[PDB]
Design an enzyme around this catalytic site. Structure first.
Site, short mmCIF file in Angstrom:
data_model
loop_
_atom_site.label_atom_id
_atom_site.label_comp_id
_atom_site.label_asym_id
_atom_site.label_seq_id
_atom_site.Cartn_x
_atom_site.Cartn_y
_atom_site.Cartn_z
N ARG A 38 34.30 35.18 30.19
CA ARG A 38 34.69 35.38 31.58
C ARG A 38 34.90 36.85 31.91
NH1 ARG A 38 40.06 33.98 35.02
NH2 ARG A 38 39.05 33.61 37.05
N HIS A 42 33.17 38.82 35.02
CA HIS A 42 33.90 39.60 36.01
C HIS A 42 33.60 41.09 35.92
CE1 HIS A 42 37.21 36.53 37.35
NE2 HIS A 42 35.98 36.08 37.52
N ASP A 43 33.06 41.54 34.79
CA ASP A 43 32.72 42.95 34.69
C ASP A 43 31.42 43.16 35.45
OD1 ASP A 43 32.27 45.60 34.06
OD2 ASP A 43 31.43 45.19 32.08
N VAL A 46 31.06 43.29 39.42
CA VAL A 46 31.70 44.39 40.15
C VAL A 46 31.11 45.72 39.66
CG1 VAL A 46 33.87 45.45 40.85
CG2 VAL A 46 33.79 43.01 40.30
N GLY A 48 28.37 46.14 38.46
CA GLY A 48 27.56 45.94 37.28
C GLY A 48 28.37 45.90 36.00
N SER A 52 34.05 48.47 33.86
CA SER A 52 35.02 48.93 34.85
C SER A 52 36.27 48.05 34.85
CB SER A 52 34.40 48.96 36.25
OG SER A 52 34.04 47.67 36.71
N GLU A 64 41.12 46.84 38.37
CA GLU A 64 40.55 45.59 38.84
C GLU A 64 41.36 44.42 38.29
OE1 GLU A 64 36.36 45.33 37.86
OE2 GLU A 64 36.08 47.44 38.39
N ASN A 70 41.38 38.25 39.07
CA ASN A 70 41.77 38.67 37.73
C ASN A 70 43.26 38.56 37.42
OD1 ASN A 70 39.23 39.47 36.62
ND2 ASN A 70 39.31 41.32 37.88
N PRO A 139 33.63 35.49 43.10
CA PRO A 139 33.67 34.22 43.83
C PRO A 139 34.99 33.50 43.57
CG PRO A 139 32.41 33.95 41.85
CD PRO A 139 32.64 35.44 42.01
N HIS A 170 31.70 27.03 32.44
CA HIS A 170 32.87 26.18 32.57
C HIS A 170 32.77 24.96 31.66
CE1 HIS A 170 33.89 27.95 36.82
NE2 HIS A 170 34.17 28.78 35.83
N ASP A 222 36.25 21.27 31.06
CA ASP A 222 35.36 20.20 30.60
C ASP A 222 36.16 19.11 29.90
OD1 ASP A 222 33.45 18.58 29.47
OD2 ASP A 222 32.46 20.16 28.32
N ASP A 230 28.53 23.48 25.34
CA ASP A 230 27.43 22.54 25.38
C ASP A 230 27.10 22.17 26.82
OD1 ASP A 230 29.61 21.00 26.07
OD2 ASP A 230 29.68 19.92 24.15
C1 HEM Z 1 30.20 30.22 40.27
C2 HEM Z 1 31.49 30.78 40.58
C3 HEM Z 1 32.61 30.72 39.74
C4 HEM Z 1 33.88 30.51 40.17
C5 HEM Z 1 34.32 30.31 41.62
C6 HEM Z 1 34.74 30.53 39.03
C7 HEM Z 1 36.11 30.27 39.05
C8 HEM Z 1 36.96 30.21 37.94
C9 HEM Z 1 38.37 29.88 38.00
C10 HEM Z 1 39.17 29.46 39.23
C11 HEM Z 1 38.84 29.94 36.72
C12 HEM Z 1 40.27 29.62 36.32
C13 HEM Z 1 41.09 30.87 36.06
C14 HEM Z 1 42.55 30.58 35.76
O1 HEM Z 1 43.02 29.48 36.12
O2 HEM Z 1 43.22 31.45 35.18
C15 HEM Z 1 37.72 30.31 35.88
C16 HEM Z 1 37.75 30.35 34.48
C17 HEM Z 1 36.65 30.54 33.64
N1 HEM Z 1 35.39 30.86 34.10
FE1 HEM Z 1 34.70 30.80 35.99
N2 HEM Z 1 34.02 30.77 37.87
C18 HEM Z 1 32.71 30.93 38.30
C19 HEM Z 1 31.68 31.33 37.46
C20 HEM Z 1 31.75 31.60 36.10
C21 HEM Z 1 30.68 32.18 35.30
C22 HEM Z 1 29.35 32.66 35.89
C23 HEM Z 1 31.16 32.28 34.02
C24 HEM Z 1 30.55 32.79 32.86
C25 HEM Z 1 29.14 32.78 32.58
C26 HEM Z 1 32.52 31.77 34.06
C27 HEM Z 1 33.33 31.55 32.96
C28 HEM Z 1 34.63 31.08 32.96
C29 HEM Z 1 35.36 30.72 31.79
C30 HEM Z 1 34.78 30.65 30.38
C31 HEM Z 1 36.63 30.42 32.19
C32 HEM Z 1 37.81 30.10 31.28
C33 HEM Z 1 38.50 31.39 30.89
C34 HEM Z 1 39.76 31.17 30.09
O3 HEM Z 1 40.09 30.00 29.78
O4 HEM Z 1 40.43 32.17 29.76
N3 HEM Z 1 32.90 31.42 35.34
N4 HEM Z 1 36.56 30.45 36.63
CA LIG Z 2 32.07 46.20 36.34
CA LIG Z 3 32.00 21.62 26.64
#
Ligand code: HEM
Ligand SMILES: [Ca+2]
Ligand SMILES: [Ca+2]
EC number: 1.11.1.7
Length: 306
Positions: A38, A42-43, A46, A48, A52, A64, A70, A139, A170, A222, A230
């Site tokens: 993640r 997020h890097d 913003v 690229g 940052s 950031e 964040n 997003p 996710h 999940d 997976d």
């Molecule tokens: C499509 C838009 C996306 C939205 C709106 C979004 C939103 C979120 C939100 C709300 C969380 C929960 C954060 C928290 O409760 O602290 C999160 C966690 C996470 N997101 Fe996304 N996400 C998106 C795309 C992605 C992408 C593109 C990746 C990576 C390729 C990603 C990887 C993760 C991971 C692995 C977590 C868990 C992090 C942790 O448990 O520390 N997300 N995301």
């Molecule tokens: Ca960046």
């Molecule tokens: Ca899984």
């Protein structure tokens, strides 16, 4: 141009050092792999993938880390500091923080059971952090599908496959109750739950996130395989079991004509998903990088060199 062999001469052991660091951390923190992937996301969204996001506050620019996407969410920064130090010891002033985080993301995915591949390298580190840009570009879970598509296109990812495949991140990790409270009790001011959320799962989630309860409580993205990388994430969507709004919209939005077939294809084949994930990951990793002599090879990822 970024290349996977960038450090094959200057620091051939960089990938191994990063892997070792994550393996050790995973023993005490099983969530770190997800957290690191993640951070890379997020890097890259913003200015690229320029590390940052790793910069701390200065009197000239804000970090950031205080962005809405964040703050009290992004984690794992000390782990990045640790692998950076280990890499700096093995290869002084060689591997940029931007590249380090990219490798860390890929290794995290692989360690969690996902695909294995060599990421393009050669990125350099930013000379500043972009808080306002982070607030604008990251997003949010409450985004509609058109808004999600807009957010990805804004940073350079035009393809629906980019959005659907990367959302597969996710397939593991945690999410705070705060982000689904509306879906559970009052969605879009209807006073009712989100109709696209499976009613059996709704009950389960309501039990984990009761009204007026602890909004910071964590829930698994999940429900099938919480910590394994997976394609189960897509099987969940097909059953209306995506956790956040942005997850389920990939399958249920009125604007999902182009994303539904992708969700199904990824749910039907691990190989198809994995191939698409690597393809999308490398595209995201190619977002406006600083290369050549631009930027620097940051020694301490938290501060610009002086
Ligand atoms: C499509 C838009 C996306 C939205 C709106 C979004 C939103 C979120 C939100 C709300 C969380 C929960 C954060 C928290 O409760 O602290 C999160 C966690 C996470 N997101 Fe996304 N996400 C998106 C795309 C992605 C992408 C593109 C990746 C990576 C390729 C990603 C990887 C993760 C991971 C692995 C977590 C868990 C992090 C942790 O448990 O520390 N997300 N995301
Ligand atoms: Ca960046
Ligand atoms: Ca899984």
């Amino acid at each position: 141009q970024l290349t996977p062999t960038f450090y094959d001469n200057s620091c051939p052991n960089v990938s191994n050092i990063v892997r070792d660091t994550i393996v050790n951390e995973l023993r005490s923190d099983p969530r770190i792999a997800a957290s690191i992937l993640r951070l890379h996301f997020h890097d890259c969204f913003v200015n690229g993938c320029d590390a940052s996001i790793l910069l701390d506050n200065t009197t000239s620019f804000r970090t950031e880390k205080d962005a809405f996407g964040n703050a009290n969410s992004a984690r794992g920064f000390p782990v990045i500091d640790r692998m950076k130090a280990a890499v700096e010891s093995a290869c002084p002033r060689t591997v940029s923080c931007a590249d380090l985080l990219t490798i860390a993301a890929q290794q995290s995915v692989t360690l969690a059971g996902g695909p294995s591949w060599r990421v393009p390298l050669g990125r350099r580190d930013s000379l500043q952090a972009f808080l306002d840009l982070a607030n604008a570009n990251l997003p949010a879970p409450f985004f509609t599908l058109p808004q999600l598509k807009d957010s990805f296109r804004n940073v350079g990812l035009n393809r629906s496959s980019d959005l659907v495949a990367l959302s597969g991140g996710h397939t593991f990790g945690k999410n705070q109750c705060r982000f689904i409270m509306d879906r559970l009790y009052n969605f879009s001011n209807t006073g009712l739950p989100d109709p696209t959320l499976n009613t059996t799962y709704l009950q389960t989630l309501r039990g984990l996130c009761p009204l007026n309860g602890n909004l910071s409580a964590l829930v698994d993205f999940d429900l099938r395989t919480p910590t394994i990388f997976d394609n189960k994430y897509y099987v969940n969507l097909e059953e209306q079991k995506g956790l956040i709004q942005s997850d389920q919209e990939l399958f249920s939005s009125p604007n999902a004509t182009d994303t539904i077939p992708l969700v199904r294809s990824f749910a039907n084949s691990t190989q198809t998903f994995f191939n698409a994930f690597v393809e999308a990951m490398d595209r995201m990793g190619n977002i406006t990088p600083l290369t050549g002599t631009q930027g620097q090879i940051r020694l301490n990822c938290r501060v610009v060199n002086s």
